Design a binder for this molecule. Structure first.
Ligand SMILES: CCCCCCCCO[C@@H]1O[C@H](CO)[C@@H](O)[C@H](O)[C@H]1O
Ligand SMILES: CCCCCCCCO[C@@H]1O[C@H](CO)[C@@H](O)[C@H](O)[C@H]1O
Ligand SMILES: CCCCCCCCO[C@@H]1O[C@H](CO)[C@@H](O)[C@H](O)[C@H]1O
Ligand SMILES: CCCCCCCCCCCC[N+](C)(C)[O-]
Ligand SMILES: CCCCCCCCCCCC[N+](C)(C)[O-]
Length: 809
């Protein structure tokens, strides 16, 4: 059995516990909301953005949001190229809009639905040497296994809508919002979730399981100027197939296969054929071999996993044409993109396709030895190793041409454009392009190999438990070998199990980013010119634009200290604990100069702190108090998190800037963190079951410290005189931007889930499921944008209904 000091710092959510928490989009990170050690992006749940299907972003003890280890079925599900794009916030032009974009796709490469999952193991504190490639938390999601006894199976269906959603939108925006001209202002929409599961035995000793799961979301979108309604789309799919076979020997062989594409359908604004789609996800193949020997257990795995973020546009060339201007009106340009009174231009097309992928083959092996007493104490030993050979690419699939400067001869020479038979950049009689920019077919490619091994020894003298462990890893990307001591202890103060202390000190090293590699060539373009529209294209010249590059880096780590205490007061367990995290050597941005050419490059100048006091109360067993039965759980936390100005790996170092902030003139690097920094929150869950009418009545209540919004001075406060804070440093001379707080008040969150089951033909049932999400519909500020000039507040979703129908057998 696992050591008591490590369980103290992990969560376990089995499938029946999952079904009893009320949910929107079922997604992995959503399930973390009952964990007092985690926080979410200020924008992660917002009323502007239903219809969106991605996973929320999460940060453990205020560590980076892209420094978590997300696993599925114990294997990595992390994007190690570009996971923290735009520090996790959305972009009015999602990445791929523009020709020279590095695709994003976020911290998880497979977006797995909250069905499909048997158990979720969530480690945040005193983590095991067995787990690496994180600074923050570990989030292992175990999919459904086959059963060998019966032929289970289920078909579900589930939906929500704009009708059914009550919105909260600022005014200021409400005009623009309801026009539906903004991608991420979605007033009208429909989500649809299908699922199908087949459990299937073959022998007394072998069976498989097929599962499928589709989430889809349609969002209308309008072009002013172009004057068209197009439909945005969001599709997530998961196909899953697992066999298991028990040998004559008593050893076990498993085999998994997964395919988890997701895509997002977008539109370049007011552009004829402006469409483009952003595919993500990929697939897996496992093969796993348990062996049960006299000494212990030995599980040996081989795996392969292709994952890919690709942007693909409706067309592979882009033009900007003129509809009309002084002296000119086209017979051929129907549409417009601008609406100027005296001049209108018309954009058409797009920037080809292009992508990043990672192909990777993995070989794990883990040993669980049987306990062994030696020199008077028990030795639970684990050890193991693993190695991963991977290859990352970026590719533009084919040459994409953009139109350059325009000509529109008018007046004396008004009709005189004479085109070439094939010429995509010439409209006979009207207009042509003098220059033309070619973004070329390209390819950049890394192939690497990481190695890791770990040894742990949980020893116990009775009363005591003390588990020193080591994880050693080497990435040949940075070529660093890192050694991570993990230490975790526990003491029982009087037999009993009534009163136990525990603590520990550990170090977690992160995995790779490697975006700066993939961007190396990126944004190369070759521009040509021509005198007339029958001249040949003449003077090709290669520009690179912003150049990116590799540098000599340390691997970012996080150091931990923990101390806690678990009391059993009555028939109710009160466990309270402290954790502190120094996050160190965190990647950021530098501009460096090589040969007169300049280069964006990664540094190790970021840093973070995390400090959390967490309490947790939970009764021993449910109350049967009588005609129904009720269980309950209660979490709470107090949380101070810190940060540089280096928010993520593409943030430049603006620490030495001077900034006014709360009343006194100070350096920017020392100001409060403004994402993942809610000072406290408490939450209670109550699951109620009325067996008399087969009705489940699940409620989540929560009281939460309010948001604190900031805005900034549009104009820098110049400083010898010009603010009475300039005296905080009389010598200082220069500018400084002032931050203006608005402290919103603490708020009550309240969520419901009903689930009624109903027999149909003996062994079958039909299940009705209803979620009421913001029950009181009360308004809460989540996030604040803009200068003081124009401040914009964003709110948490109002009351929302989800309706589900399941059919089991
Ligand atoms: C279980 C074995 C996997 C079977 C899935 C085969 C279908 C994969 O389809 C492919 O997947 C990649 C990422 O999704 C894309 O980049 C490819 O262009 C696409 O054709
Ligand atoms: C768990 C600890 C294992 C240590 C292995 C260190 C390997 C360092 O050795 C390097 O590894 C590269 C990638 O594998 C090779 O291609 C290089 O030739 C070699 O310099
Ligand atoms: C068994 C008792 C568990 C509680 C451990 C006390 C942890 C105190 O630890 C301290 O907490 C401060 C917060 O006020 C932080 O400012 C400091 O960084 C930290 O050293
Ligand atoms: C038994 C379940 C198998 C899943 C069937 C999925 C069928 C659709 C495959 C994708 C094709 C696109 N579209 C829009 C028709 O769905
Ligand atoms: C892991 C076993 C699952 C195998 C399923 C293979 C998917 C077949 C492709 C059908 C079309 C899928 N897509 C992307 C169009 O939706």
């Amino acid at each position: 059995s696992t050591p008591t000091s490590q369980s103290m710092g992990m969560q376990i959510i089995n499938a029946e516990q999952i079904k009893k928490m009320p949910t929107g989009n079922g997604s992995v990170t959503e399930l973390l909301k009952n964990n007092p050690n985690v926080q979410f992006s200020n924008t992660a749940s917002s009323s502007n953005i239903p219809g969106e299907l991605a996973p929320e972003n999460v940060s453990f003890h205020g560590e980076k949001f892209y420094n978590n280890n997300f696993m599925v079925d114990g294997l990595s599900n992390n994007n190690n190229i570009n996971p923290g794009a735009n520090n996790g916030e959305l972009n009015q032009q999602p990445d791929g809009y523009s020709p020279a974009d590095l695709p994003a796709g976020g911290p998880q490469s497979f977006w797995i639905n909250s069905e499909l999952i048997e158990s979720l193991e969530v480690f945040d504190s005193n983590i095991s040497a067995k787990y690496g490639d994180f600074t923050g938390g570990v989030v292992d999601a175990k999919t459904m296994d086959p059963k060998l006894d019966k032929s289970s199976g289920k078909i579900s269906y589930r939906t929500t809508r704009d009708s059914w959603t009550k919105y909260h939108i600022s005014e200021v925006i409400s005009e623009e919002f309801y026009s539906g001209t903004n991608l991420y202002y979605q007033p009208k929409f429909k989500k649809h979730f299908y699922s199908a599961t087949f459990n299937q035995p073959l022998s007394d000793k072998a069976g498989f399981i097929f599962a499928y799961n589709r989430q889809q979301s349609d969002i209308p979108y309008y072009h002013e100027y172009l004057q068209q309604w197009d439909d945005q789309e969001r599709i997530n799919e998961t196909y899953l197939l697992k066999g298991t076979y028990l040998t004559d020997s008593g050893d076990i062989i498993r085999m998994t296969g997964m395919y988890s594409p997701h895509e997002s359908k977008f539109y370049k604004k007011d552009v004829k054929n402006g469409g483009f789609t952003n595919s993500g996800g990929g697939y897996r193949f496992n093969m796993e071999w348990e062996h049960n020997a006299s000494w212990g257990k030995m599980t040996s795995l081989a795996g392969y996993q292709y994952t890919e973020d690709k942007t693909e546009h409706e067309a592979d060339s882009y033009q900007t044409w003129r509809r009309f201007s002084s002296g000119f009106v086209s017979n051929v340009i129907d549409w417009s993109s601008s609406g100027g009174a005296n001049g209108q231009n018309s954009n058409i097309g797009g920037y080809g396709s292009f992508a990043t992928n990672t192909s990777s083959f993995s070989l794990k092996q883990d040993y669980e030895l049987n306990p062994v007493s030696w020199y008077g104490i028990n030795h639970q030993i684990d050890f193991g190793w693993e190695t991963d050979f991977y290859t990352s690419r970026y590719r533009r699939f084919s040459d994409v041409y953009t139109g350059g400067v325009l000509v529109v001869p008018t007046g004396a020479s008004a009709g005189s454009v004479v085109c070439q038979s094939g010429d995509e950049l010439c409209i006979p009689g009207e207009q042509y392009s003098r220059t033309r920019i070619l973004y070329p077919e390209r390819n950049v490619q890394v192939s690497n190999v990481n190695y890791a091994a770990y040894l742990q020894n949980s020893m116990s003298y009775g009363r005591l438990e003390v588990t020193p462990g080591v994880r050693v890893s080497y990435d040949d990307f940075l070529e660093n070998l890192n050694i991570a001591p993990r230490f975790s202890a526990s003491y029982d103060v009087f037999g009993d199990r009534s009163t136990r202390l525990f603590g520990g000190a550990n170090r977690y090293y992160a995995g790779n980013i490697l975006a700066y590699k993939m961007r190396q060539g990126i944004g190369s373009n070759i521009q040509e010119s021509r005198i007339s529209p029958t001249a040949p294209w003449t003077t090709p010249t290669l520009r690179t634009g912003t150049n990116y590059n590799v540098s000599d880096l340390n691997t970012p780590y996080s150091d931990e200290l923990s101390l806690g205490l678990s009391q059993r007061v009555m028939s109710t367990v009160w466990t309270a604990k402290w954790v502190n995290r120094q996050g160190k050597e965190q990647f950021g941005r530098e501009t460096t100069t090589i040969d007169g050419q300049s280069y964006r490059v990664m540094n190790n100048k970021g840093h973070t702190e995390g400090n959390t006091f967490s309490l947790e109360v939970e009764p021993i067993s449910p109350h049967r108090f009588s005609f129904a039965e009720v269980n309950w759980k209660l979490g709470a936390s107090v949380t101070k998190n810190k940060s540089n100005s280096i928010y993520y790996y593409d943030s430049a170092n603006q620490d030495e800037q001077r900034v006014i902030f709360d009343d006194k003139l100070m350096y920017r690097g020392d100001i409060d963190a403004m994402n993942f920094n809610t000072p406290w929150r408490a939450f209670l869950n109550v699951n109620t079951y009325f067996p008399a009418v087969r009705l489940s009545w699940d409620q989540r209540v929560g009281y939460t410290a309010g948001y604190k919004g900031y805005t900034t001075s549009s104009i820098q406060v110049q400083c010898p005189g010009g603010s009475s804070a300039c005296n905080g440093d009389p010598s200082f001379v220069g500018g400084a931007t002032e931050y203006f707080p608005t402290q919103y008040d603490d708020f009550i969150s309240y969520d419901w889930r009903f689930s009624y089951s109903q027999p149909v033909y003996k062994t079958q049932t039909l299940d009705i499921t209803l979620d009421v999400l913001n029950v009181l519909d009360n308004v809460v500020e989540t996030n604040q944008t803009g200068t003081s000039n124009k401040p914009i507040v964003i709110y948490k979703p109002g009351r929302q209904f989800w309706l589900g129908v399941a059919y089991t057998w």
